[PDB]
Amino acid sequence: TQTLELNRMRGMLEDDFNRKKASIRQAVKEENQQLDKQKRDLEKQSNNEKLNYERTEIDMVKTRGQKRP
Amino acid sequence: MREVISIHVGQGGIQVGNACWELFCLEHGIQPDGQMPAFNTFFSETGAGKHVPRAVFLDLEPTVIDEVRTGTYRQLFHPEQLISGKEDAANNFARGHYTIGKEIVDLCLDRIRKLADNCTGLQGFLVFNSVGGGTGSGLGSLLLERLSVDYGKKSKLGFTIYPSPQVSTAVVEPYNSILSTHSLLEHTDVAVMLDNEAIYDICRRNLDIERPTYTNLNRLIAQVISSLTASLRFDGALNVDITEFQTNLVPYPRIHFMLSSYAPIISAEKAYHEQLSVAEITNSAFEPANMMAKCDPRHGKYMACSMMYRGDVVPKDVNASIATIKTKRTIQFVDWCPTGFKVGINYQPPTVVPGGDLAKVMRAVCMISNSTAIAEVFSRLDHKFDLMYAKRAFVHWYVGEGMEEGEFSEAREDLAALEKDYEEVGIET
Ligand SMILES: Nc1nc2c(ncn2[C@@H]2O[C@H](COP(=O)(O)OP(=O)(O)OP(=O)(O)O)[C@@H](O)[C@H]2O)c(=O)[nH]1
Ligand SMILES: [Mg+2]
């Protein structure tokens, strides 16, 4: 009975340790998923901003007609 | 602790691999996202959460690798296992064997090494190469040689889509097929000749689809390969380890070119009027008409027949059926092989592909026959070669890429020496 009381100790401790480590790994996976959104969004913002700026530049250039004094 | 490594070089290879990964993911309860809503043989867990496949996808035309990079499986494969170059193979062997691959083989082999470092019970390799093309021929044979000089003892299978007998898909196909057949003679342990002409016939007659397309063809190829690998993957009352084929079907060291077959490939409503017992299913299995390759086994001798059954199968009827099929006089074996059968059993019934033309049935058989009639194919193919080498046609597109011309000669002559084996082994003692 004592050796069973102790083997269940070992078993419970190990089947808790492993679940804890797997939880840590899942948390790291979530952290990387989160980090991905930064490079997903900053690039979108910079793309839209380049679009706006270069469109405004095209406009300002094209807005040169004739003077006719 | 038992797994494989599947390579899909060339153009047809990546297609049949797409269909095969579809089938594998769908039977294993693996979502196309790589997350589950047996896989140690093919897939691998990324520590936690999702699965990733064991494969490398080579090509030089970035077309198909891109199409899979943004298709339905964009989020399944490791983006380092999809190697697409810049220029194209252009159907000439030397383009994918001396100039382009000359350095791409370094990256591909380093990725193969990094994969094999993670495998724990690796058994063998499953390569795929449409030899009629350029990159699947050149790069494929070069990888074959590189692995045979790198690893060694590990087995090397193959599922080659040779040029059809009659229908034409290219004009230079005899050259870059003969070259790869000469470069594949020794480095590969088992060659399973697949031909897009017999399967067109089948899909036309049995499956009743009048206007088939490489999609359905590749579905069928995936079904064949899954019925082959069910031994390793799932349970079976009599299992075979892939190293079985390397020693049951290769009598002499050079001759290892066999042809495959599957049963029962019947549409739904056409099989609804059928009981499909082991007797009739195995009597249809040997039918020369529905062989995956193209030949006339009734005009040749057999040498070895592996037969993997899957589904709820009763063994007594298996043995009875094989006895009665060895009774036939039209089907005869050679003198030096009296025990001309090798069977296996897997309890896993066939899995249907959702949206597939194939019908669901409990008992299925997959046969791999090392025969001697397939020999004539090479002859016929060699035929074509001569009618081109008689005037050195198209050779400048090959001599321009560093390939020494004389190679051609040697290959076509040395491949002809295969006959010295074939027409010899067909002769009794
Ligand atoms: N089963 C099957 N066979 C195919 C498929 N696509 C092409 N094939 C066959 O493969 C051969 C086509 O040659 P390719 O493989 O495209 O030539 P290549 O070596 O890839 O050279 P590149 O096109 O420059 O990459 C033909 O014999 C086709 O019948 C497919 O999707 N499924
Ligand atoms: Mg191609």
Side-chain angles (χ1 to χ4, degrees):
Chain A
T1 51
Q2 157 169 354
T3 204
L4 258 291
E5 283 180 359
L6 269 189
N7 176 74
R8 292 267 274 277
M9 169 180 171
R10 263 199 308 275
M12 205 275 271
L13 286 193
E14 290 301 307
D15 284 349
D16 185 286
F17 182 80
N18 263 337
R19 300 189 317 104
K20 197 201 308 292
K21 283 322 169 190
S23 176
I24 284 293
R25 282 216 205 91
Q26 271 301 328
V28 172
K29 162 179 178 173
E30 183 272 349
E31 171 169 339
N32 283 110
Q33 293 270 87
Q34 156 55 42
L35 258 290
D36 176 272
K37 299 267 195 170
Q38 266 72 14
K39 279 74 173 183
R40 257 192 161 210
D41 272 7
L42 281 183
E43 296 294 328
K44 189 63 65 180
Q45 163 194 355
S46 278
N47 263 16
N48 280 187
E49 208 285 334
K50 280 193 314 304
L51 161 63
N52 311 332
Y53 163 69
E54 273 181 48
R55 183 64 56 125
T56 298
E57 173 75 18
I58 294 177
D59 189 329
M60 263 312 303
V61 160
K62 186 191 282 283
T63 305
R64 287 303 181 282
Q66 295 316 124
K67 263 58 169 181
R68 287 294 95 193
Chain B
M1 49 190 79
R2 50 196 185 278
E3 71 281 3
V4 303
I5 283 294
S6 54
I7 307 193
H8 310 279
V9 296
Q11 152 75 32
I14 186 175
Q15 296 289 120
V16 287
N18 225 326
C20 167
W21 290 117
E22 192 269 7
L23 171 54
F24 285 171
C25 275
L26 265 295
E27 68 173 358
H28 272 235
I30 301 285
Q31 280 193 230
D33 292 7
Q35 309 192 355
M36 186 159 44
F39 43 73
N40 193 28
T41 65
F42 281 105
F43 305 164
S44 158
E45 290 292 47
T46 183
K50 73 186 286 292
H51 310 259
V52 301
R54 285 189 181 81
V56 299
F57 279 40
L58 266 46
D59 204 316
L60 312 182
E61 48 190 358
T63 83
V64 292
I65 297 181
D66 191 328
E67 202 205 357
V68 79
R69 266 153 149 172
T70 187
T72 320
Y73 303 131
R74 96 189 68 84
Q75 217 180 357
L76 184 53
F77 308 88
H78 189 295
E80 197 184 352
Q81 296 151 352
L82 323 171
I83 318 303
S84 57
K86 313 310 281 314
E87 302 275 300
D88 316 328
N91 294 316
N92 62 304
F93 184 87
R95 188 54 181 284
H97 186 284
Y98 286 136
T99 77
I100 299 292
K102 195 175 212 143
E103 71 273 40
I104 321 299
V105 301
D106 204 338
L107 193 152
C108 172
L109 288 176
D110 283 339
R111 275 304 313 197
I112 293 296
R113 166 77 78 177
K114 261 182 52 180
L115 267 187
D117 210 4
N118 190 27
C119 317
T120 172
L122 205 163
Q123 306 293 321
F125 307 143
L126 268 44
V127 301
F128 293 79
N129 50 3
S130 77
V131 312
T135 182
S137 297
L139 190 49
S141 299
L142 189 55
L143 256 69
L144 277 186
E145 293 146 334
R146 286 306 280 266
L147 290 196
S148 198
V149 302
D150 188 307
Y151 290 67
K153 67 181 291 294
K154 306 301 283 288
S155 158
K156 271 88 74 177
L157 270 77
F159 290 74
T160 82
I161 304 193
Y162 277 0
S164 88
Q166 218 180 26
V167 309
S168 195
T169 174
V171 291
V172 78
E173 83 192 333
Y175 280 97
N176 56 328
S177 177
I178 286 301
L179 305 201
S180 275
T181 309
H182 173 71
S183 192
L184 169 148
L185 214 66
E186 62 276 19
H187 313 83
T188 289
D189 305 354
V190 187
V192 181
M193 307 303 186
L194 268 47
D195 190 306
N196 289 334
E197 205 289 327
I199 310 195
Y200 276 168
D201 288 331
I202 295 186
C203 292
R204 196 264 320 282
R205 47 195 284 162
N206 286 66
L207 308 179
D208 301 270
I209 61 184
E210 184 65 26
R211 275 76 179 266
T213 290
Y214 292 92
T215 64
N216 315 326
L217 156 63
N218 291 17
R219 292 283 169 80
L220 202 150
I221 306 305
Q223 207 77 58
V224 160
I225 297 196
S226 197
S227 159
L228 184 80
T229 318
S231 51
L232 257 60
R233 274 199 276 98
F234 266 95
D235 185 5
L238 177 52
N239 79 320
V240 306
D241 268 330
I242 214 161
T243 302
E244 189 75 28
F245 309 111
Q246 190 259 330
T247 176
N248 272 337
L249 318 168
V250 196
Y252 294 158
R254 187 186 277 179
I255 45 170
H256 44 83
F257 309 138
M258 50 215 61
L259 74 162
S260 86
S261 291
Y262 184 93
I265 37 186
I266 311 283
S267 180
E269 275 82 358
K270 189 174 175 181
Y272 164 63
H273 299 281
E274 191 47 284
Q275 304 290 154
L276 278 194
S277 177
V278 167
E280 47 209 9
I281 201 176
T282 194
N283 287 323
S284 176
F286 272 49
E287 176 45 34
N290 72 316
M291 303 295 268
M292 297 304 111
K294 204 46 183 54
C295 73
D296 53 353
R298 288 167 300 103
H299 284 162
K301 286 171 178 288
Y302 273 63
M303 269 160 51
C305 294
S306 297
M307 299 177 60
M308 273 49 69
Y309 291 22
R310 59 166 311 153
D312 290 331
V313 185
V314 301
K316 79 203 315 176
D317 218 8
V318 190
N319 274 138
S321 280
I322 313 180
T324 74
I325 211 167
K326 206 198 286 183
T327 309
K328 297 195 161 195
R329 316 169 221 287
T330 182
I331 288 298
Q332 74 283 49
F333 296 91
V334 191
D335 189 353
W336 50 266
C337 168
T339 78
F341 288 103
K342 160 65 199 64
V343 311
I345 310 282
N346 305 329
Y347 280 115
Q348 191 179 11
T351 171
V352 71
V353 178
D357 44 24
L358 214 58
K360 169 168 161 296
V361 70
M362 306 328 283
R363 296 158 303 266
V365 309
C366 168
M367 180 180 70
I368 290 89
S369 316
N370 185 348
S371 88
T372 200
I374 189 172
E376 71 93 32
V377 168
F378 292 96
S379 158
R380 172 191 81 217
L381 202 150
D382 257 0
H383 180 41
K384 293 198 199 315
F385 190 112
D386 269 330
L387 261 66
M388 304 187 181
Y389 199 74
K391 296 180 289 296
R392 305 310 190 283
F394 307 101
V395 306
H396 56 88
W397 291 96
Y398 288 86
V399 77
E401 303 317 300
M403 162 166 300
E404 178 76 18
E405 183 276 338
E407 179 173 18
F408 290 158
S409 88
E410 172 208 336
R412 192 264 166 285
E413 307 317 311
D414 184 76
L415 187 141
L418 262 179
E419 299 327 289
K420 173 180 69 57
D421 279 318
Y422 277 143
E423 305 173 358
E424 156 168 320
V425 307
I427 286 283
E428 80 157 4
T429 62

